[PDB]
């Protein structure tokens, strides 16, 4: 599908370019930022010179009553912090000329798609997300957007590959879109507002549900683990930990050493600005730092099946996550060990991805002994009314026997400007 797209905006050979057969010209403003870790991730600020303009080849300029078309892209929208963002819809992707064409716009907790013909007939499809929520799947996290348009039926908006809303557009007549596509914050009153965007595509047909799911999987880069926000998980980067079975708890340490243990304690508390957002605090607990087991690779991205060590930060000092698997029972309680005294304790962790129909960017950690034998996925277990962190082959066996397992799925949360906590 990507090879058949009429616009394939990608960053390669050290420049942003249209990879389609049309090779439409790209005009990049001076205040456009490209992520050094992944230059396909584009940051657009609320500045006149923070814009990208695509000069479409004349053959693909939309001017039709009947041609179906679709668009897909990923977006990461920082949390709205101020009341100035209320009741302020602002365009981000503009293909309107004389108020005919299409455009993508944003508002407080909304992603909006608008179609309008040449006779003042308009239709909108909207995806709504709340900021009054403990843990949000959408606030400041990478979202895959797909919008399809059937001129004889409906316009549909998809989020992470799932249909969210559809509205009829068959009453619209001739849609004559703009000769260009302007990626730019237009009409936003929040001077600090920005967006992240990547993998923009334009299609000259109505994508079906299977094609959208396949695009969502192909562009997810499943061989690379992700942090909570959807960026690449990295080594040597401090992360606040979130266990998905107990989202209201955070990781803490009950004394350093084999005599102590790591556990989950709550509540997290809340961060809030009245009438704007009310969420669970994410910057809580002892931070984890992922360390390389194979130092022969210079790259700092954590990939699937990588073996790692887990460092634990306690009072600005780093310790080693480990356990003695010879302890009684199937739930091996984890401790934070002094790095010089790890000895032969089990500490090697195999990082894994976990992709189901729930929250994205799940990670799993399979602890192994120094001989390579599985100790079990890292989760937690109730000991004396305390949720102590454990490694248990019980988790691994349920997955092997097609049983559902919860408690061993984690998210790594780094400090990000889009969260502001
Ligand atoms: Na270390």
Numbering used by the authors: 873 to 1293
From the paper:
Botulinum neurotoxin (BoNT) is the active agent that causes the deadly condition botulism. The smaller 50 kDa light chain (LC) possesses a single zinc-endopeptidase domain whereas the larger 100 kDa heavy chain is comprised of two domains—a target cell receptor binding (HC) domain and a translocation (HN) domain. The BoNT HC domain is responsible for targeting the toxin to a specific cell type and the specific receptors involved have been identified for most serotypes. As with all reported structures of the BoNT receptor binding domain, present is a characteristic β-jellyroll fold at the N-terminal half and a predominantly β-trefoil fold at the C-terminal half of the protein.
We have identified a single crystallisation condition that produced two crystal forms of HC/A1—one possessed the equivalent disulphide bond whereas the other did not. Using 25% w/v PEG 1500 and 0.1 M MIB pH 4.0, HC/A1 crystallised into orthorhombic crystals with the space group P212121 (crystal form 1) that diffracted to a resolution of 1.45 Å. No disulphide bond was observed in this structure. Instead, Cys1235 rotated away from the junction due to a backbone rotation, bringing the neighbouring Lys1236 toward Cys1280. Our findings suggest that the crystallisation condition is not the only determinant as to whether the bond is present or not. For example, serotype /A binds to a glycosylated luminal domain of the synaptic vesicle 2 (SV2) protein, preferentially to the C isoform (SV2C), as well as a ganglioside, namely GT1b.
